[PDB]
């Protein structure tokens, strides 16, 4: 049953009249006069009318001569283990000139909420290979830990490096990366594709690539398709899955465009009032489930407009995620790779993945001691540059030197260098050795003896 009754077209939205039996969120197909097919979703259904959003937009559609078909089910992803190694576009269509996926089953891309009773709490270490993360802001299996960045900052290189190096020490060959690109430039897409292909990371990955030049309502579907593939691999195939999504500020833009087309009253800073809830339906899909071996870990990546952390996109993301990794322009100017500022960074669940049996027994103590010493030394630098070298005390000058070496040699490891957790902790002890023993108050003394030369 095909309807020739399209009434009007407003941006990506379309109104269909004289419909019957249509459901909220039902998948639709528009058969255009040129014969191409555009898929869409029912946003609102009343009486004999239905309101739909078209993922590819309505440009070039002659509605009087195009027909609409309602398909009787929500938008789904055909999932299969064969998706590993494949590159798809924002709507889940092959992008690598490879064969069409033969799905094991089709899954509603909205997913379902995990019963809190059935949840397992995030546990066990994920080695990113990046000292500033692994040591001070440890990523744990099942956590949501985002990167807050800015335009011109190298979050692109950081995302690729984590995809390339992330691993679990506990298990072998059960680790998979799902990478969702949202509104990224062609050059950014080029960079991610070559990096995954040249290192072989593609052979344990699934990629969903939405580009800036692509229709923007595709972005609504893109992260939901990535998370549906991840949940399949984790919960039905038992894999440890890491989902990396960039750039979520481009996701919010798509939501704002839909909101505008619907003539909804805008919320704070022109973003929809339901922005928190919408983002929660993505980020809360992370976790572990009791009795299942797999896991879904999420690293959303976003740029803070005007570097303002109080902007609705970083602010609401921080109100959902379990910590955050902050990149700054000051560290980037100094050449620090990655330019992670550990002072506003945090991982809330880190203690569940550290210590004896997971990393090493000295992990927590040296984390607290390095952090304390670095804050004190950054404050010492702040006095020395502003008030001159002489004003700073002798003990303070040590801390200033420490802070500089911490940035230049500990945080700054390079976007193409992988550090094991042992290398990171040993490097941490080499930096603490700059400080006098009378200053290592946070570290127990038998640990001090054992691990200090």
């Amino acid at each position: 049953k095909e309807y020739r009754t399209i009434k009007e077209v407003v941006g990506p939205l379309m109104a269909v009249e004289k419909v019957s039996g249509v459901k909220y969120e039902e998948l639709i197909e528009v058969r255009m006069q040129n014969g191409e097919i555009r898929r869409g979703q029912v946003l609102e259904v009343q009486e004999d009318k239905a309101m739909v959003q078209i993922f590819e937009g309505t440009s070039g559609i002659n509605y009087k001569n195009s027909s609409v078909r309602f398909l009787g089910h929500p938008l789904q992803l055909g999932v299969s283990e064969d998706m590993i190694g494949r590159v798809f576009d924002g709507l889940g269509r092959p992008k690598d000139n490879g064969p069409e996926i033969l799905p094991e089953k089709y899954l509603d891309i909205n997913g379902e909420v995990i019963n809190p009773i059935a949840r397992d709490y995030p546990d066990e270490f994920i080695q990113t290979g990046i000292s500033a993360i692994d040591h001070l802001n440890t990523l744990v299996r099942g956590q949501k830990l985002p990167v807050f960045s800015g335009s011109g900052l190298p979050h692109k290189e950081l995302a690729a490096q984590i995809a390339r190096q992330a691993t679990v020490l506990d298990s072998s060959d059960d680790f998979a990366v799902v990478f969702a690109a949202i509104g990224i430039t062609f050059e950014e897409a080029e960079f991610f594709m070559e990096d995954f292909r040249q290192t072989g990371a593609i052979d344990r990955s699934v990629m969903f690539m939405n580009l800036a030049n692509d229709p923007a309502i595709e972005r609504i579907a893109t992260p939901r398709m990535a998370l549906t593939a991840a949940e399949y691999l984790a919960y039905e195939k038992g894999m440890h899955v890491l989902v990396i999504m960039t750039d979520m500020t481009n996701y919010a833009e798509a939501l704002r465009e839909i909101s505008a087309a619907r003539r909804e009253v805008p919320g704070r800073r022109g973003y929809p009032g339901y922005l928190y809830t919408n983002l929660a339906t993505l980020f809360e899909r992370a976790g572990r489930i009791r009795g299942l071996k797999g896991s879904v870990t999420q690293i959303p990546i976003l740029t803070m407009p005007e570097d303002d952390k109080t902007h609705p996109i970083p602010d609401l993301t921080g109100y959902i995620t379990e910590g955050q990794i902050i990149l700054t322009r000051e560290l980037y100017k100094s050449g620090i790779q990655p330019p992670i500022d550990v002072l506003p960074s945090l991982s809330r669940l880190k203690d569940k993945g550290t210590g004896a049996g997971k990393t090493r027994e000295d992990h927590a103590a040296t984390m607290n001691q390095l952090f304390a010493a670095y804050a004190q030394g950054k404050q010492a630098k702040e006095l020395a540059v502003v008030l001159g070298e002489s004003a700073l005390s002798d003990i303070d000058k040590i801390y200033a030197k420490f802070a500089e070496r911490f940035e230049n040699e500990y945080v700054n490891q390079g976007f193409y260098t992988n550090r094991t957790i042992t290398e990171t902790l040993d490097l941490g002890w080499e930096l603490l050795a700059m400080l006098p023993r009378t200053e290592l108050k946070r570290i127990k003394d038998d640990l001090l003896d054992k691990y200090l030369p």
Partner: protein, 588 residues
């Protein structure tokens, strides 16, 4: 028979259905072929506007709607303690077993309580007694510590004709009352509409301080049993940790924790950890006094509002038995935002910042349900509800409608600070901006119950912290070296207050809780160092020398937070070591 409506529109959680002419505002409805749970909120002729407490994907016009003739309610009876419910009181563990799924489906109706479980009902009321609402006819030992009292439901009056002790399910009739309408059977279970406050005889002033074990709260910004406290703060500042701490250690009878639009893992953390936190006095775990209401951020948005009223109604039920209850709402901002979303769907005219014009009165009605009360019943027993509410203002800016409307009605404000949190000063309570309008009265209670001059210790400590604020502005003017020896001592004492008393690690085995008397000893020691050091300075002693000769004793002060509760003499002995050390320094 009963009227069947017909859906004419579906838009997210808003459903409109025609042919509902026989239904009432606030009736619950089974919506669509699936029969998902919804509530009638407004009516224009036969067309009802229904907000749905479940996902509406796959539902469309033409499907049936059926009113239940009843408003949103809870089941109140044995089997409610130690459970985790969703926002409309469905038991999440039974949900998992019945549907055989790890995920949340819809269209399945599950009774809130176990109606097949056998309980032992102990009858305590004599036959022939005249009873009315709130009168206790018997009890069930739901836990060894907590007696579940069986109360005559509101609207029932008469004389007891038959009552019998025995083992019954919550459906069995355990008592028979002769009323003017006729003979009435009573079970151990009563229903109550969540949006209506449970009636009481009268409110009382909440004047007994709660012991949270959190030093900054109990000492400087105390909440009382029956009081209300707001904890607004930016993301990562510590709102949830503060609420978990109060849930763990507070000296109330029962705790109702409402996870309102927050993270699933945090609910999972409570059900995992609370059964392993065992009270040394009674041998019971914290889960034996706790009720969990969970509606996460990605759960149905309209069910956030339901979770709030489900939680408070359960609290009121146990209050009516004569218990002290704490209810934590984490976070009320998510409830408010749900109201804002539905208000936009209904095309209502907005109030402040997009929120419905009735936001302020809804918030105020919620907190008026907390308080210390005389419950209904001949014995006139007393119970209380203490309300602790997180607020989650965008960008940490407290000048927004949810925070502002809340501060109009609550008497305690724990303002969490971004700078403190980033400095790892936890709890991140801004001690200059926070306040408790219970401080004075609590001071008198504490003075009398400790037989000590506690109120003056609290005053002096806050004076020192306020002078630290002024002195920091003066250091800002001319630097630390210009300051007098007494000014720099003040900075040191305030520094000890901030680091050795205010800062408290919720994740440390000892530091996570500090008894009332250990708090007294810790603050006395800290202030004693201030008292003795100035006396030295007046006697000609030197601040730099006083600091260099008190390294070890000040080290003891910094560790008194880790001193075990059975060893408090180790803390109180510090004072005389302080005296002796400083006396010897002025001699030298």
């Amino acid at each position: 028979g009963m009227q069947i409506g017909k859906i004419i529109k579906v838009s997210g959680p808003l459903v409109m259905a025609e042919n509902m002419s026989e239904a009432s505002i606030q009736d619950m409805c089974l919506v669509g072929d699936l029969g998902v749970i919804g509530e009638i909120i407004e009516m224009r002729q036969d067309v009802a506007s229904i907000q749905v407490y479940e996902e509406t994907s796959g539902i469309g016009p033409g499907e049936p709607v059926r009113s239940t003739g009843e408003a949103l309610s809870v089941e109140l009876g044995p089997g409610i303690i130690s459970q985790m419910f969703d926002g409309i009181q469905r038991p999440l563990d039974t949900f998992m077993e019945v549907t055989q799924s790890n995920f949340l489906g819809r269209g399945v109706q599950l009774p809130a309580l176990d109606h097949e479980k056998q309980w032992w009902f102990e009858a305590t009321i004599e036959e022939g007694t005249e009873v009315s609402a709130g009168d206790i006819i018997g009890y069930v030992d739901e836990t060894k510590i907590i007696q579940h009292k069986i109360m005559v439901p509101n609207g029932i009056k008469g004389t007891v004709q038959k009552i019998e002790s025995g083992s019954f399910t919550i459906d069995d009739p355990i008592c028979v009352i002769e009323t003017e309408q006729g003979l009435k059977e009573l079970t151990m279970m009563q229903k109550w509409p969540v949006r209506r406050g449970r009636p009481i005889k009268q409110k009382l002033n909440p004047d007994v301080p709660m012991i949270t074990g959190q030093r900054v709260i109990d000492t400087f910004f105390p909440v009382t049993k029956g009081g209300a406290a707001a904890v607004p703060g930016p993301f990562g500042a510590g709102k949830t940790v503060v609420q978990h701490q109060i849930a763990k250690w507070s000296d109330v009878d029962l705790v109702v924790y409402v996870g309102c639009g927050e993270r699933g893992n945090e609910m999972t953390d409570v059900v995992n950890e609370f059964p392993e936190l065992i009270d040394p006095n009674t041998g019971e775990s914290l889960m034996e006094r706790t009720v969990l209401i969970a509606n996460t951020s990605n759960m149905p948005v309209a069910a956030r509002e339901a979770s709030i009223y489900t939680g408070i109604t359960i609290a009121e039920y146990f209050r009516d038995m004569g218990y002290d209850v704490a209810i934590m709402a984490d976070s009320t901002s998510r409830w408010a935002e749900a109201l804002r979303e539905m208000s936009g769907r209904l095309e209502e005219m907005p109030g402040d910042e997009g929120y419905p014009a009735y936001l302020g009165s809804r918030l105020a009605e919620y907190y008026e349900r907390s308080g210390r009360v005389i419950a209904l019943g001949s014995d006139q027993r007393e119970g209380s509800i203490t309300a602790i509410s997180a607020v989650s203002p965008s960008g940490g800016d407290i000048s927004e409608p949810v925070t502002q409307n809340t501060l109009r009605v609550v008497k305690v404000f724990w303002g969490l600070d971004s700078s403190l949190a980033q400095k790892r000063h936890f709890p991140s309570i801004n001690w200059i901006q926070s306040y408790s309008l219970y401080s004075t009265e609590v001071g008198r209670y504490m003075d009398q119950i400790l037989q000590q001059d506690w109120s003056d210790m609290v005053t002096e400590g806050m004076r020192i912290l306020q002078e630290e604020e002024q002195l920091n502005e003066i250091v800002r003017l001319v630097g630390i070296d210009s300051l007098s020896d007494n000014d720099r001592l003040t900075l040191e004492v305030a520094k000890s207050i901030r680091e050795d008393y205010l800062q408290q690690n919720a994740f440390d085995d000892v530091d996570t809780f500090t008894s009332r008397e250990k708090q007294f000893n810790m603050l006395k020691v800290i202030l004693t160092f201030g008292k003795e050091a100035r006396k030295a300075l007046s006697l000609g002693a030197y601040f730099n020398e006083i600091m260099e000769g008190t390294v070890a004793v000040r080290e003891r002060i910094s560790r008194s937070k880790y001193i075990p509760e059975e060893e408090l003499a180790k803390i109180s002995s510090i004072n005389e070591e302080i005296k002796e050390t400083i006396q010897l320094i002025v001699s030298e």
